[PDB]
């Protein structure tokens, strides 16, 4: 494993942007956090982050004792936030099998799940291989909410305390035999002012 995926699915593009209003006039938008992927990676146990996501029914230690292992992954993000507009997540998947996806997306705070966000894609043939592209989509309020609040909060440190406690789990399976086919725990800190989005995977090992 030397990316976000397995031998079956693989995470090529993630981005959470917003673009100012005046977009229009000049082109630009703002990356919150970026995954891009147009030697083995480095393992974290999965224990040491039990705790950041709730030992709930359906939770990551669950999901991870069912396995395969060689599917369960972290990010951890560098968050910029220093930058209304649009807001708006962008991802694409690949993989060599024809496949249905549903992915579900579960914002967590403290413990607690907060929203969960389910998509079904279908995949499209482009040279060889099947991408399943969900661009440009609206980002989901609640997250929206959070980074106005977030950058009101007057201090670095302040803002990693409260993302300390803020998790997404990723669970993506084949639509039509149940299978998992990639599960990531991302967690959260902010970048300092002057460094622009930054992000690490991991395995998950035990
Ligand atoms: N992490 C993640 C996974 C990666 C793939 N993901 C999606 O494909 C996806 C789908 N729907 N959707 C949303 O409506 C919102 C977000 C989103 C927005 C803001 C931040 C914020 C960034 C700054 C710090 C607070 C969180 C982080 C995530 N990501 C996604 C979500």
Known sequence: ARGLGTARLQLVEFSAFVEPPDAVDSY??????????????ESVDVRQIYDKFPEKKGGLRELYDRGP???????????????????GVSSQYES???????????????????????????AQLEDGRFVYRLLRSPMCEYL?????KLRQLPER????????????????????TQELLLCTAYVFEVST??????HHIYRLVR
């Open 28 to 41: 630009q938008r703002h990356l919150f956090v970026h995954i891009s992927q147009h030697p083995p990676l």
């Open 69 to 87: 292992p060689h599917a369960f992954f972290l990010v951890k993000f560098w968050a910029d936030l220093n930058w209304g507009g649009f807001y």
């Open 96 to 122: 060599l099998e024809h496949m249905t996806l549903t992915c579900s997306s579960k914002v967590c705070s403290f413990g607690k799940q907060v929203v969960e966000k389910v998509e079904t894609e279908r």
């Open 144 to 148: 929206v909410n959070f980074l106005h």
């Open 157 to 176: 440190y302040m803002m990693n305390s409260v993302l300390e406690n803020f998790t997404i789990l990723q669970v993506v399976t084949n639509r039509d």
């Open 193 to 198: 002012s002057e460094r622009g989005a930054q």
